[PDB]
Amino acid sequence: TVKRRNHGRNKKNRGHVCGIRCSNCGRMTPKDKAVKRFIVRNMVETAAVRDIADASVYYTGYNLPKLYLKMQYCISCAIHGRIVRVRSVENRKIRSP
Amino acid sequence: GRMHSKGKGISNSCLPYRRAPSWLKTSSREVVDQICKLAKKGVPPAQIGIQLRDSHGIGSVKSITGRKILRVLKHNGLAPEIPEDLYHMIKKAVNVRKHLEKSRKDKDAKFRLVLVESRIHRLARYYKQTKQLPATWKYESSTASALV
Amino acid sequence: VRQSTLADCLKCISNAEKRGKRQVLVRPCSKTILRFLRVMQKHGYIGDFEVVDNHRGNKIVIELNGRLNKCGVISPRYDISLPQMEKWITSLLPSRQFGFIVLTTSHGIMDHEEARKKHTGGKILGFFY
Amino acid sequence: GSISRPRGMRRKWRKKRMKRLQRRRRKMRQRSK
Amino acid sequence: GKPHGIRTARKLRSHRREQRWADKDYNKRNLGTTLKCSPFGGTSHVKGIVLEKVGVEAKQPNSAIRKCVRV
Amino acid sequence: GRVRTKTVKRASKVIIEKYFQKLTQDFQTNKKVICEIAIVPSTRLRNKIAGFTTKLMKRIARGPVRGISLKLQEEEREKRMDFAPEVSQVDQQIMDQGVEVDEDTLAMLAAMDMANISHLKKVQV
Amino acid sequence: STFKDSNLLFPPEASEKRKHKLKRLVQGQNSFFMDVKCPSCWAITIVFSHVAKVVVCSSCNTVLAQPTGGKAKLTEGCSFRKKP
Amino acid sequence: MLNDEGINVDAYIPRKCSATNQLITAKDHASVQFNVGLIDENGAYIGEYKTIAFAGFLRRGAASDQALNRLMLAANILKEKG
Amino acid sequence: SKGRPILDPTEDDIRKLLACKVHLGTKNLVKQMERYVYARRKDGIHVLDLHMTWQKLVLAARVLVAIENPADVCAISARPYGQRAILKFSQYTGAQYVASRFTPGALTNQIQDTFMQPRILLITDPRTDHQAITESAYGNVPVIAFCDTDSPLVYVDLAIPCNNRGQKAIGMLYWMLTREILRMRGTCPRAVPWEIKVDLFFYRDPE
Amino acid sequence: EWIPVTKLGRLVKEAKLRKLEEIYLFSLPVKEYQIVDEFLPSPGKLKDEVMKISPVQKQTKAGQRTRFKAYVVVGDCDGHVGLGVRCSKEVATAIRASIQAAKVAVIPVRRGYWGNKIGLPHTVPCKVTGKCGSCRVRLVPAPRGAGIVAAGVPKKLLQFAGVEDCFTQSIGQTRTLGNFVKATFAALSKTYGFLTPDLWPETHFVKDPYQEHTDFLSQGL
RNA sequence: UCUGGUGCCAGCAGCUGCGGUAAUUCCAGCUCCGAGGGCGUAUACUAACAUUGCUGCUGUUAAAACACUUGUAGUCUGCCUAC
RNA sequence: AUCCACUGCAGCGAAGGCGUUCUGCAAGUGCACGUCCGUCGAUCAAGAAUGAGAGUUCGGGGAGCAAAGAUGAUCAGACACCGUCGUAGUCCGGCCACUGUAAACGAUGCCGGCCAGGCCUUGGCAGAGCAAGAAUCCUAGACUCUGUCAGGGCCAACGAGAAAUCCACAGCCUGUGGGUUCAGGGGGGAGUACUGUCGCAAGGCUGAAACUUAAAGGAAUUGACGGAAUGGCACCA
RNA sequence: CACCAUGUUCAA
Ligand SMILES: [Zn+2]
């Protein structure tokens, strides 16, 4: 009952992979087993972009600064905060978004 | 490179089919004289062959004078006391020991030293069997330094 | 590492026949290998074969004709008397009618039927059917 | 879940109970000898 | 795998001999502790004196009382 | 919801394919047409079939409804598809602009024969 | 493009040019020798294609080929011609 | 096969793949049999043909097309470029 | 075509093939089709020699003409480019054909309405007609396919190097094939160009 | 009563095909047991046996559904044998459909000689092995007076296939009757599969029935 | 799928199981089956058993690849030398 | 103390393991080659050298985190999860400190031969290209294509398998033999007892039996369930 | 992401 051909991780030709810490839980998870997402947001969402750009001087729409986060998750917190969802046995082989 | 590693490489040279290319008017006495000239200068057989292959157009000394390089060295009294395989392995072990004796906590120089000394003994066994080395011969770390 | 060139040759030939190849390359060649191949030819399980000179353990190209089912080597080369011939037949061959055991005997590398008819035993060397 | 049916308690914890038992035994035999 | 090769007779025989000890039937037959420990010291029948009667509750799913005697 | 059943749809389809020349886009005359065409045991079923047929006829009027075969129009489409132009488009094309043939395709036509043939454009990539 | 199943005994030139110097049907050399001359002189040195160390003139001692990882790199202007 | 009298005891001697030499068994529903027509000099087809049986093993290994190529080269049908 | 010169291609035929682009492959290659590709263009397309294309075309013609009772031949094409071609091919040879979607189990399900038990079947594209090839395997019928340079010729017995993805390429190939099949049997002559155009085989949209 | 569906059905209904080897020679699918009932009549030239009727259960909510797999062997003792495994909800229909499937799956069993070729073939021509699941079943050629030395399932299959002598070596979970009978059936199948010097010579292809009766087959449409 | 008694009791039963008031299995009666001047029981060993595997086992997950290299004894070792 | 992002179906190392920059020291693999030797090799009981983390020893260090402990909640209990602290420990050095175990895993011994196709990637070597800053010159370690050797993977035939699955192997296996080492023989008792040996200790290695039991177990299926996910729904919500 | 422990024996 090996569930994954790569046993939940992308470690190949390695022996040891650095252990990183989950973003919220704080769990030590291998760097390749972790579900990692580099997310880019804005300091301001469109619920406030007009209200701030109307009072800004050096900014406007399409100009506000961004947030670059790189959230790394353990499998538990990924599945709970629904970053990832359980997939079918046949749809587990899908590796592109 | 398969003996003491996971290496599976095959990069070795490959002779022709001929066994002289109809050029190289140079003949046996000349090539042997060249061999002995650059053997007097301390150059070992493997380097003799390369210095005679690169710029002199003499590949496969054997083909010009059927005696291989070590044969023509022994036939002129210029062959070393210990074969160059052993000699270079001894020198490598000497350097590794010299290193780790001060880098006392390498723990990988130690492993590679175990390997190179195992090779040294596996080859010294063969040479003692073939009588190229004296029957009493033995590789000691403490005295190998005074051979290079 | 590289035991029994004959074993490697026979396994290559059997794998080629199994894959359906019409000619197989074998590397290197030996006297034992050539005599085994000639014993196969004599009964027609093997087409022509020719040796290409490497100057380094010459190689062989055998032409296969679909009549082979299996070539194998029996290692170690057990000794075989004439009473043991029937034991080896009933254990190795698929039938008592066709298929052959190759034996190295004091009379050269020999078929098992030829060995039985000219009254000699020897060391087993393989089989083909 | 990650494993199939230990037919007792967790093998790590019964291994640990065995180790504690073993050194209690060791102390009782060191009493005598 | 096992050693083929025409001079591995000692290896093969010693391995078979040291490995036969994992057959529990052979092991109990050859290990001289059953003649010692078993009450029938290698014997079909023995004679004894009835010491007491015993009612033994049958194992699940059965619920009888088997009548035995301590001998 | 008012999703129809196949006992209505598959009857609408054959009624259309057999009587497209008689029906209209009017429900209450398609009703009187079907009440003489079909033997429907129920008037509610008659009216469901009639309404679905009027819907399909309205879609016919609108545009190409995918799923019916009006023969007296599909024979027309078939015979126009089977109409022959006097000159094959490929013939007049090789007359007008020859044929664009690349470097290695000229190399292949030279490898075989047909190398020095007419109407080539000698194009390269 | 042949329609023919190339037998191993007579292999095509295209495929046999690609093969490793060992995995050919007959193992052969993957090198050659060169007659080489520098404009600074006339002596025709005979060098190896894949030189292992530096090669200089017999008299001028000006480097002709300089060793690299693979084939030799002949110096600026040194004319060369492959030998049979 | 016969029985020492020259009397064929084997019913249904099967047919063999023409590329390999392997027997086509009684359940090889992937095997095929052909008829490549023969043609006179004037381009017409006389009712003559060369027959070719292929085995399901070949037709799975995908060497059936190249086997046909080889067989027609042997039978002087496919024209080599030259 | 080996001994027969009258079956060799004509200059006009090669011109109208190069026109319909049947000499062009795709950026992908199969090692079983590597034998029919002459070379590559520096944009990647594999040009495949109309010589071998014509050899395999006249070979398929030989098989199709040796097959008497042409109603035992089924042309198959699933993609839109090719259905008009197979319809015309059936019309002019006597063969049978199928619609866009091959009903799975025709060549296996005996109690099926669309049984279609042929003696041979001619397939436009293997990658698209993967089904009929499988049922061929299950039913012992040979397969003659128009194999592009990107085509699994697993159960294909007679592959023909083609394009399979050009609406005029398919029409051209089926026109050539039916022309050869009608030249054989003594129905069509050689010198006289036969009256049916190639424009009838190409794919025309409904409107 | 039996309106033939396939070309083989029509040919055997109209006596264009003579007997089974005419279909075996081209390996054509049968798909209709009426063909083999035409060539081997029901009572006499074909005996059928029911080896086992095993219930299998699919669990459902509110109960569990039980259905019987019937294993039926079909054969006359001259070299033909077939194996049909068919589920059904009732034992009657299971057995009937299994007889039909076994009749469709009837195959020819090559028979050979162990030693001298004196009379008629009596044993398997070669050592054969059949696989299904873990059950490997080896059929070994036995001499004239050895008899069938199999165990029940292979014994009756070999009896039906009409071999007089055979040694066997079953290796798997032989108590699984399904696989244990499929293995020996597969072995009897490989019997003709193995190639011998007897079959070394030329092929000499023939017209298949479809080509040979193309004119007849093009009328019933 | 016999008849009476018993009613998870008595008991049977190598294993699976039978016995809880309609027991095809207990206690009996009748009947029937098997070996038969014999049959049962217990114990030991053999075969079954390719479940000790030389022929001839298995080792990803069922029992079982040493953490990993080295390395002695042991085992095994490339091509060639007469018409 | 630790070296984010870069950081990956990337590389290296016998494995454990290895990530800031400059630098000292020795080393390895691969590749290239008409260099040398000339069988010197494969696997290996005993033996030897490395061996995560925990643990121990001697001397320092102590930010952060944290067994034990303290302590506030939660709870029926809660010296549990949760929260606040907190000691050993984690960090450094040592006769070359000791130990010598891990789901030390690819749960897959090592050497050798053969094994369809397609795709990605690492390092060379070879041959080409429309292929690169400042400029426009000029070359350039960049990029593209092809071949090949070595490495790391992915998906796809035959075959194998109980299946899951394997696929440069878990294929070539009842059509069974290339060579070699280790281990297993129903489940427990038990990796226990005794003994031996190593260690400061913890403990490692070695390692039974009496007795007990008919199943343990593996893969897969159908249903049921879920304080699992998704999507529909009901005033018996 | 408060807390949500349990269900006598054989039989089906
Ligand atoms: Zn988390």
Numbering used by the authors:
A (entry chain Sb): 2 to 98
B (entry chain ST): 2 to 20, 22 to 150
C (entry chain SJ): 2 to 130
D (entry chain L3): 2 to 34
E (entry chain SP): 2 to 72
F (entry chain SV): 2 to 126
G (entry chain Sc): 2 to 85
H (entry chain SY): 1 to 82
Paper passage:
In summary, the Euglena cytoribosome is an unusual RNP, which is distinct from other ribosomes in that it harbours four unique core ribosomal proteins, while its LSU rRNA is highly fragmented.
Multibody refinement followed by particle polishing resulted in an improved density map with an overall resolution of 3 Å for the entire particle, and 3.0, 3.02 and 3.13 Å for the LSU, SSU-body and SSU-head, respectively. For the LSU, all of the rRNA segments were readily visible, indicating that although the rRNA in this ribosome is highly fragmented, the RNA segments interact extensively to form the universally conserved ribosome backbone. Notable differences were observed in the protein composition of the LSU, and include the absence of RP eL28 and the presence of three Euglena-specific proteins, denoted here as eLEgr1, eLEgr2 and eLEgr3. The cryo-EM structure reveals that, as in kinetoplastids, the Euglena LSU shares a similar fold with other eukaryotic ribosomes, and although the number of LSU rRNA segments in this ribosome species is doubled compared to kinetoplastids, its RNA chain termini also face the solvent-exposed region, clustering in focal points that largely overlap those observed in trypanosomatids. Our cryo-EM analysis enabled the direct visualization of 186 Nm residues in the Euglena ribosome, revealing their 3D context. A notable feature of this ribosome is a cluster of five m1A residues localized to a distinctive LSU rRNA expansion segment on the ribosomal surface and adjacent to the protein exit tunnel.
